[PDB]
């Protein structure tokens, strides 16, 4: 529960309907239910899980940034801005803890294939990164290092087992690079990773079918966009 009584296949089907309806909270609940059935997830199913929670936490993060900016200006008016920022922050942390919980129980340990393990370690990095965005206390450092460790293990596996154009490998590198830039205060590390990733993918585009070429160049453009912003 609350999805325990619904068939796995029905949960997947309803996740896809919720995505078309832009009902991302429903989508994430359906995909959480699907994960909790205990079977491995397919590539499409992993993508559904990731898209759902990305959109849920994306809205929360966007709201948090608005409120944090207002709170900061108000410290340059009562407890209300801090209270409401804290409310959003707590909900955001709960979503991150839920996702990390699914990964730890038991998606990562049951992921035999390199491609599946890389996918989930990348998600682990992302959700510790979102926790780091709002962390201020004694656990900020532990959270940052946990994100780095998850990302780096994913990079190590992706480099041995995936080609440099693989879109999951490219999305991992994109996000690890952003982690370096704005979480770890390592902008040269961020720029170096985005550049090497872009160039190594460029050099293997010649090996791709028309479909794979489109997949790869879509994510390479994001790397270029960040290099453009950062240099």
């Amino acid at each position: 529960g609350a999805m325990g009584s619904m068939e796995r296949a029905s949960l997947i089907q309803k996740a896809k309907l919720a995505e078309q309806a832009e009902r991302y909270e429903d989508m994430a609940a359906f995909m959480k239910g699907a994960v909790e059935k205990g079977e491995e997830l397919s590539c499409e199913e992993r993508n559904l899980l990731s898209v759902a929670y990305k959109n849920v936490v994306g809205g929360q993060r966007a709201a948090w940034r608005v409120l944090s900016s207002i709170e900061q200006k108000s410290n340059e008016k009562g407890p209300e801005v801090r209270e409401y920022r804290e409310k959003v922050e707590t909900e955001l942390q709960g979503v991150c803890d839920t996702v990390l919980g699914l990964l730890d129980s038991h998606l990562i340990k049951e992921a035999g294939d390199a491609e599946s393990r890389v996918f989930y370690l990348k998600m682990k990095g992302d959700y510790y990164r979102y926790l780091a965005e709002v962390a201020t206390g004694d656990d900020k450092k532990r959270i940052i290092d946990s994100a780095r460790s998850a990302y780096q293990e994913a990079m190590d596996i992706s480099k041995k087992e995936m080609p440099p154009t693989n879109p999951i490998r490219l999305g991992l590198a994109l996000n690890f690079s952003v982690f370096h830039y704005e979480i770890a205060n390592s902008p040269e590390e961020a720029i170096s990773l985005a550049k090497t990733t872009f160039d190594e993918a460029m050099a293997d585009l010649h090996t791709l079918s028309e479909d794979s070429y489109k997949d790869s160049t879509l994510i390479m453009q994001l790397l270029r966009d960040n290099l453009t912003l950062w240099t």
């Binding site: 994109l174 952003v178 704005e182 994001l222 966009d225």
Partner: peptide, 5 residues
């Protein structure tokens, strides 16, 4: 413009 992930 905001960096992309």
């Amino acid at each position: 413009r905001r960096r992309q992930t």
